[PDB]
Each structure stands twice: as C-alpha cells, then as structure tokens.
C-alpha cells in the first residue's frame, strides 16, 4: 500500500512525555512514489518538509530538535522504520516508525530512549 495523502491527526498519546523525558496538532501531507517520499508536517505556526528514499541516508531533526542523519528501511509491506543518529551531541536513542492499517489509518511512533509516543492519522 501507498502512504500518499492529506492526513489529519485523530489520536495522540505520550507527546508531552516524549517531550517531558526529553529536554522540551500537526497535519501531514505525504507523496510516495515507489520507495521515494515527500512528507510535509505543519501546525498553525510551523512547517517542515523532508525528502527521502528508503535505504538512502538523509538529514532531519530529533524529537527534541537536534540535527540527525536518518535511514529508513521497510520492516514489512506496510511499515517503515527510521534510525536516527545526532550530527553533533550526546543524547537518548531516537527513532520513528510509520505504518498503514488495512483500514487506512496511518500510525506514527516516535521513540526517545525508552519512551514511545503514538500518533494516529486518517485521510481528509
């Protein structure tokens, strides 16, 4: 399945704790063509865009905001996983996953050391 769409958030669990264990309502637009992705995430006041291909390193930021090199792999046909490494600093191990349900929900998880936050999106 293909992750393209305009995605609205419907659930969120542990965002502040991801935030509270770390230092410190986004809409998401995805275009996927094969293994190539564009993901734009925005709130009312902030926006960011990433471009990556599965299996190719790229640069982005950690939950707490620090510069990182990322690499995405497929865990299955419906789920991708991303390992991150800070470009400069020491820190918690951070990563994220995105997967699609058969019903077309997009589930994001974000992990910072042992704390996991889950966000769920549907297409609008």
| Pair type for strands 47-53 and 58-61 | unpaired
Q: Is 42 in the site for Na ion (CB under 5 A)?
A: no
Determine if residue 121 is labeled as part of a ligand binding site.
yes
Complex with Na ion: residue 32 or 95, whichever CB lies closer: 95
User: Of residues 4, 12, 61, 78, which one binds Na ion by CB under 5 A?
Assistant: 61
For Na ion, which is the closer residue by CB, 31 or 85? 85
- The yes or no reply on residue 1 touching Na ion (CB under 5 A) is no
Answer yes or no: are the C-beta atoms of 29 and 39 closer than 8 Å.
Answer: yes
| Nearest-angstrom CA–CA distance, 93 and 33 | 29
**Contact flag: residue 104 with Na ion (CB under 5 A):** no
């Amino acid at each position: 399945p293909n992750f393209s769409g305009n995605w609205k958030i419907i659930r969120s669990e542990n965002w502040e704790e991801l935030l509270k264990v770390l230092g410190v309502k986004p809409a998401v637009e995805i275009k996927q063509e094969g293994d190539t992705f564009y993901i734009k995430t925005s709130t009312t006041v902030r926006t960011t865009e990433i471009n990556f291909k599965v299996g190719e390193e790229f640069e982005e930021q950690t939950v707490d905001g620090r510069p990182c090199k990322s690499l995405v792999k497929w865990e299955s046909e419906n789920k991708m996983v991303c390992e991150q490494k800070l470009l400069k600093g020491e820190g918690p191990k951070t990563s994220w996953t995105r997967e699609l349900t058969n019903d077309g929900e997009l589930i994001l998880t974000m992990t910072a050391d042992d704390v996991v936050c889950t966000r769920v999106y549907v297409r609008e």
